[PDB]
């Protein structure tokens, strides 16, 4: 039951799974969104605010900012544990800015973190624009959480599971090159060769015109799993943590099911 790799971009990861059932692959895809913990702003302590944005809007904007929660999965308590008291599970960041005479934009690089290994993913995220003689002073608290509780804790942007295509060229129809939206086909010495077969989405539009020169099937036991992270965690860590969450849930269910038979 091997796993093959298609592409590895900065944040994207595409794999081929060869002997796994569709239910397990879909469960991994869903758990990559729902049951992987990341750091995000939970509460904001406001001291001053004169910006056009209200306190709730500013808190929401701060919460939507992703932080690098890669080394924090081993030093901070997960939400499944006790996590609401017993300090040592909350990180603290500060923001104290003021504009003197001209409008000033505040970026995510202005957030000072108490713990140095937890920083914003990108330092060029605009937070708020301040007019003349306006100032902001706030303190925010960060903690781990699952995407099931709130979408701000999701570590990925897109998670995709699709079928494995199989495209075979029987004839030499020239229409297929200008009909497929994915650019699977190409004309080389007038032969209609298939360049990248894995790009077909089983659209079945070439069958509407060729209808005899191209055959499309789907492999029964192979699936393509494509995920794109947001920057907090690397994709392999996301996949491993999703499968670990499945393992924990199944173990708990079996433990409390076999007991009290």
């Amino acid at each position: 039951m091997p796993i093959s790799l298609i592409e590895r971009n900065g944040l994207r990861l595409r794999l081929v799974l060869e002997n796994y059932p569709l239910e397990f692959v879909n469960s991994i895809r869903r758990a990559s969104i729902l049951y992987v913990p990341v750091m995000a702003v939970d509460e904001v302590y406001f001291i001053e605010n004169n910006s056009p944005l209200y306190d709730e809007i500013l808190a929401h904007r701060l919460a939507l900012v992703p932080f690098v929660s890669d080394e924090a999965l081993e030093h901070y308590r997960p939400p499944e544990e006790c996590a609401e008291n017993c300090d040592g599970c909350y990180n603290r960041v500060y923001l104290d800015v003021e504009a003197k005479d001209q409008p000033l934009m505040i970026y995510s690089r202005d957030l000072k973190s108490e713990d140095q290994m937890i920083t914003p993913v990108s330092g060029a995220i605009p937070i708020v624009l301040l007019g003349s003689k306006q100032k902001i002073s706030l303190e925010a608290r960060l903690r781990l959480g699952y995407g099931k509780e709130h979408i701000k804790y999701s570590p990925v942007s897109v998670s995709i599971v699709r079928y494995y295509p199989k495209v075979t060229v029987l004839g030499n129809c020239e229409k297929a090159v200008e009909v497929c939206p994915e650019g699977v086909f190409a004309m080389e010495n007038n032969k209609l060769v298939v360049k990248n077969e894995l790009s077909c989405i089983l659209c079945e539009e070439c069958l509407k015109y060729c209808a005899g020169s191209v055959s499309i099937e789907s492999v029964e036991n192979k699936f393509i799993l494509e995920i794109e992270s947001v920057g907090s965690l690397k994709p392999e860590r996301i996949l491993i943590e999703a499968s670990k969450s499945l393992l924990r849930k199944l173990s708990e269910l079996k433990s409390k099911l076999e007991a009290g038979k």
Partner: protein, 90 residues
């Protein structure tokens, strides 16, 4: 996450699980449909606003429904462990 039994016989089980949703229900149904001796297996979400599922298992008497559920859980755990061990190698 709490389980309870609505009905139970030798070849029939109805289990209500609170705290779970499609992620585990679909996996369990897919694994149960592969266990030999199981004739019917399904899961239901009684209401989208409530996080709870109901699993119905009906066998042919060769294997108890609880045993079928345990076997399905074992298969799912094996698949998860294999997936971890293979992802760690790339």
């Amino acid at each position: 996450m709490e389980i309870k039994v609505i009905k139970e016989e030798q070849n029939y089980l109805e289990l209500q699980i609170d705290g779970e949703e499609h992620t585990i229900g679909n996996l369990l149904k897919g694994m149960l449909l592969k266990v030999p001796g199981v004739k019917f297996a399904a899961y239901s979400l009684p209401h989208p606003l409530i996080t709870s599922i109901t699993i119905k298992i009906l066998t042919d008497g060769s294997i108890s429904a609880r045993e079928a559920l345990i076997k399905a859980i074992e298969l799912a755990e094996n698949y998860a462990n294999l997936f971890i061990d293979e992802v760690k190698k790339i």
